[PDB]
Design a protein around this ligand. Structure first.
Ligand SMILES: COc1cc2ncnc(Nc3cccc(O)c3)c2cc1OC
Length: 292
């Protein structure tokens, strides 16, 4: 059951206007901020629920404030009935944009530019000590205004985990960690119930980029989590290089070499995007596929 409904006023300030996420998005709304006269996003969870994650989402949103590709933090609260967080409202998500492409694929030019922006947001969340752990196309959205619509934003920190300790060292991994995320984009390490690391967010990015260009992943029709994991464990991921620019062999070899204890060479991964964009003559001003 939903805890709020359209029309509710939160803290005598945010008027809930429209439900924009249910299911795996949780309970999230477009609300009217009466202070600034603008639409914002407002996400709520029951305060009597056993696993409550908004406290951590607020912490991550606050720790990311001032980074590119993150929604501006607007407010939060906690009462006896629910917890909530309020943040900048964005536009259409990438799963929606791809499915609305009718051939269900993006061009290389759109894929490279989105992938570089997503890689930036991933390095950013890691840089504040958190793993996202559910990197997937519906957790990235473009802005909704002329000044933001060419920018891609990272969404939903509900499955995040802090991977650094008080000091800032990598924290010792648990021996077993229950599967986190979405089956389709999860790395083999999530399937093996290992503690996830920075490279596992990058594996999910690699799968997203492949799906952007090809339109599907090899395990698209497989729903059982164990069957999918067995496929990924045996899969020759070099088959996925066929439709990507040549330097993605470097990207795949790099992430394949990483483990929980190895910091990714983000500069190398970035150069894969930069060099590819240059080889294909992609300019930032060029239209994205949905702008055609
Ligand atoms: C227009 O549609 C959406 C617009 C959104 N705008 C901002 N945040 C979202 N989500 C978000 C951001 C940070 C943390 C979190 O838990 C959730 C959005 C989700 C949407 O659809 C679900």
């Amino acid at each position: 059951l939903d805890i709020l409904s359209v029309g509710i006023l939160v803290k005598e300030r945010w008027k809930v206007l429209r439900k924009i996420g249910g299911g795996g998005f949780g309970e999230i709304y477009d609300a009217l901020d009466m202070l600034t006269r603008e639409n914002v996003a407002l996400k709520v969870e029951s305060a009597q629920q056993p696993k409550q994650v908004l406290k951590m989402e607020v912490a991550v949103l606050k720790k990311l404030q001032g980074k590119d590709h993150v929604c501006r933090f607007i407010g939060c609260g906690r009462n006896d009935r629910f917890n909530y967080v309020v943040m900048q409202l964005q536009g259409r998500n990438l799963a929606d944009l791809r499915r609305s492409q009718s051939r269900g694929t993006f061009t290389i030019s759109t894929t490279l530019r989105l992938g570089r922006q997503i890689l930036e947001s991933i390095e950013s969340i890691h840089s504040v000590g958190f793993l996202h752990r559910d990197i997937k196309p519906s957790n990235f959205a473009m802005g909704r205004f002329p000044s933001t619509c060419r920018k891609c934003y990272m969404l939903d920190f509900g499955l995040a985990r802090q991977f650094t300790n008080s000091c800032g060292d990598v924290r010792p991994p648990r021996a077993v960690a229950g599967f986190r995320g979405t089956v389709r984009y999860a790395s083999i390490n999530a399937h093996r119930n290992r503690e996830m690391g920075r490279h596992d967010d990058l594996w999910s990015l690699f799968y997203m980029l492949v799906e952007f260009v090809v339109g599907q992943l090899p395990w698209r029709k497989i729903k059982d989590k164990e069957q999918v994991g067995s496929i990924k464990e045996r899969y020759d991921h070099r088959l996925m290089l066929k439709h990507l620019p040549p330097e993605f062999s470097i990207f795949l070899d790099h992430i394949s070499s990483l483990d929980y204890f190895t910091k990714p060479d983000y500069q190398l991964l970035t150069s894969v995007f930069d060099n590819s964009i240059k080889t294909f003559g992609v300019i930032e001003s060029d239209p994205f596929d949905w702008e055609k």
